[PDB]
Amino acid sequence: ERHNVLQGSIECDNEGVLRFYAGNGISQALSPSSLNTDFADNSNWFDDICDGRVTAVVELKNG
Amino acid sequence: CQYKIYPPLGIARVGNGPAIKPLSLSTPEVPWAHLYDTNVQYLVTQQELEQLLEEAFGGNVINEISQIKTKLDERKKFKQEEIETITGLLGLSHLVPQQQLSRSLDNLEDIVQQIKGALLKVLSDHYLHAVKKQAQNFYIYKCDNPVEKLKLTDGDKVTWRVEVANKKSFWYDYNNALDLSLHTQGSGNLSKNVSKHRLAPAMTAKRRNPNVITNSLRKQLVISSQGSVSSDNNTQVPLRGKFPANERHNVLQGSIECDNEGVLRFYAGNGISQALSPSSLNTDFADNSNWFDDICDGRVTAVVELKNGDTFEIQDEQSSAWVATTPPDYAPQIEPIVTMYDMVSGAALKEQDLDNLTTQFSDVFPILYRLYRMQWVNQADFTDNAVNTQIRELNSELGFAQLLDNSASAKSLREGIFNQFRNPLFDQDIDVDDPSNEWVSNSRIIPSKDETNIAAKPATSSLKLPFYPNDGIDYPGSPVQWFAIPPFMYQHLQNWAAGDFSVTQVEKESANTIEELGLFYSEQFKNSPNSALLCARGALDALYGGGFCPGVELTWPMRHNLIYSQNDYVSSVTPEINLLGLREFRLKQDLQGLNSPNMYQDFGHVIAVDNVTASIDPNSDAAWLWRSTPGDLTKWMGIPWQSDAASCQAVYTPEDFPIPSWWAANLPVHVLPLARYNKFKDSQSADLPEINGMTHSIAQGMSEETFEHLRLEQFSQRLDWLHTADLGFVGYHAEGGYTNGLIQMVSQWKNMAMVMARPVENPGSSGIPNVVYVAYSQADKD
Amino acid sequence: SCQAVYTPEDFPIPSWWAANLPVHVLPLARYNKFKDSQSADLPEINGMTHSIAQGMSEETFEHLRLEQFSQRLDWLHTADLGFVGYHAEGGYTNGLIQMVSQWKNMAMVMARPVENPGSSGIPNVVYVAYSQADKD
Amino acid sequence: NLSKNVSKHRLAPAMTAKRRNPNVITNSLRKQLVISSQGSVSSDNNTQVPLRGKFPANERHNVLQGSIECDNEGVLRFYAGNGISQALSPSSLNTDFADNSNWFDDICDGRVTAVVELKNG
Amino acid sequence: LLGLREFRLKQDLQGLNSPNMYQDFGHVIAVDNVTASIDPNSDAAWLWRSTPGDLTKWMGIPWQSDAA
Ligand SMILES: [Mg+2]
What we know:
The structure is cut from a larger assembly and holds five copies of chain A.
Chain A (H helix, E strand, L loop, with lengths): L7 E5 L5 E5 L5 E2 L15 E2 L17
Antiparallel strand pairs in A: 1-2, 3-4
Bound molecules: magnesium ion (MG).
Magnesium ion binds next to loops of chain B.
């Protein structure tokens, strides 16, 4: 019961560039016998697609 | 021949309750011992989890938390370190994963009561209403012929060894019992007519998981494990293999433990069945590729080491034992009409010598008693069985003892009952085509689901008893479509009908009702002095003995004497009371076990009755079939077992009644739910605010006749066992149906109703008996 | 499609339109096992031989009647809607498909008399489902 | 056509096979499952003659198994059926590659004989 | 070019009126019935002495399922 969902990963390099990777492509139902037989709408299923908000703060040497 | 293990074939049933003694069950070691026990608890109860928690909290533990006591107020949440000392002091790691034991108290805010309350919720979530495991005890007996249990003096030690395997995914499809075509003279279990007249021909069968090719790669499909425990340490040892074997899933095949007295306790697995891919669904009753389950069976041996330096190896087949795990028993107090113990008993008999069998009334009483009690699990035996109704008529006038009368004046009464029973010659109620001769039943047939819109031939003979399907189900119009008590039991019944039986006077004096005489016979078992043979019988008396399509626990090889290395009648239960007898039997065993060169044997692309025929000759390259290696007893059964169980229910005929049921004593088909019990268990005088589901005011305002009529209407409502959990039929436009049942049983088996004896304290004139058998699940509770 | 809608809780079973498309009925088979009094002048009485029916106490005889009266049968089972035979699928969808031909075979409920209910609790007028599967 | 090795090394074992339409029991009733017909034509008349049977054999369905005509040279011409296959109930679907209960088709096979009669008798 | 042959089917001369028109082997057919039919004197030899319907009865019913 309850599954870990890797929705993405983030990393920033020395120059301030952010890199965003998506998930592993894991889709699953809460019970093995729930089959995703509809093209769009299957109850009991999750996937690791996501979307959201990207913000930043720049902090200079002078404060 | 110094020491021997009993029972010679132990049985342990899967469940999701824990493998600890207080919360588990034990395979019967005395037949009939608990038939009317209204205190049984076959599902884990709230009270047992509380009492488990209280025992785990005995100081030292309170005092020592009265020291984390002080360090939390020198701090004024917990912290990991003191969390991990609260557990492991409680030692609940073996029952629930440590992770959520730890988060258990991480979320907390009489300090002892927030510990208990939080943990009991974790235990409850995992185990409340769980199917308790039924575990097998194995005993070392001293011999010469078992006299008494080995008693360990200080310095002595007994080491047990167990090796088990599961070969279902390695083995062949189950189409029907291959012995139905095997040439024979006839045994007490199976008449020679079935093969001689081709009444239900054996079908060829292909390999399961046929895409795995070469013997070498097919070994991956076999799950195996082994273990050892001794009387010097009572720590429990798991039996865990891998599937596929050396992906990879861990498979807990069982658990073993030995106490300081040298008794071995064997637990079966947790009931976990699974496919290698989520999308592989188990849509067939028997043969589903890509699946494994945790059923298993194998070899039980021991070494007895005395303080004297003398060591005794119990390793040969005459002294060693076997163990097999099986699906749960959902009505442990309801005995199958013909049992696996009856199969052993009949396998040593020749059909043409049955006229030399002698019969006591206690030899036929089991048939009538079991058939009568089938009313708690099967509608046809509650309301459509004229023998059961006649027994009821006899009980109502305290007249059951007339069935014990072997004189002519009672002959017509005995014949009237015997004549309703199906003859396992399978030669009645038939017309012969072409007298190339086929035997076509002229009684009611069980159609194939593949329909033909041509009017059925009208049946001209009445359907005989019992109303259950049998080995020949695949063949419409075969007399073997329907179950017969086997030849040697039918011969007893025949002798009884004729008057050729004996009975003692003390028996007649406890036979005014069937229940009264059943209690008497149960006392005879409990006071029999051969505890070894009673224990060997108790392991098999709860298991089914037909029909085999493939069955519930075990299947058809068990009904041949070829599978036993020894199978001898020893004595009656009582000096004067046979009760079907006590026997000494042992399975044939491969003494190399898991390391046998025959462990991975098969017959090529198909198995067929020709292979079985060849195996009769003990010199042949096929005789290994009968010399068991771990996994050999259960490999025949359905994979996963939950698909067999879901298809072990009713088989409907075009005629509504009676409804045929497969194996209803162990997999019930129609049950009396808890919800109905709560509407009939109270008498009108109960002083509660609700009385049988009515307000106090309504229940007492009605006439007493009306109150009693409502009790009996409730008692009469029998629910389809398949409806006691969500098997795919719940919800708006749910499909329901056979196949969803098989699919959902993989997860829902552990929620299906469990039948338990319960009291009715004051039945008054309602007609409800004082002991009822009530089906407990979560859906049917109210 | 106009029958039961099952909930996770077993009871009460919700039913759609049961007054015109019944869901649980009292079959003729059961009527023939409670309609007679213990004194009926018939060689078979409520599915028992005369001798067995008149051998039992009157109490248990009346109890047996009410037990038969209390057996209600799924209306969808009064004809072959795809659940009949070895390994038959059954289920909601086969019902829909088979009702096209089987609608004319489903059980029809009709008032019938009980001449001497006695103390059994069965009313003098019962409503009984007649079909061909439904017979005995 | 077939090597000895197939059987001798058990390369593809024969399976047992159950009856089609297994709910029809007794030989006498199973005769109804068989569709048959016959007819004759001669070189004195080229009218075509249908071969029409019934399924089930004595609602019944007419099954045109084929048609025969003979020309004035004495050549017989045989025509197969129209390709019509059907179940006894419309809900009976032919979901198996070979064995579908409740179905009949108009394929057929049988015996062809003749008599020659010359002027002199 | 693989040659020319004179061949004829084994035929039951009573055709539709044959006592063997409606013969079978019981609940199943198996290779053992075919073994017994090899001997033209045996009880199972009728399998090779064709009556009408005998050549096509083996094929799929209806033929359209086998074609598909
Ligand atoms: Mg049972």
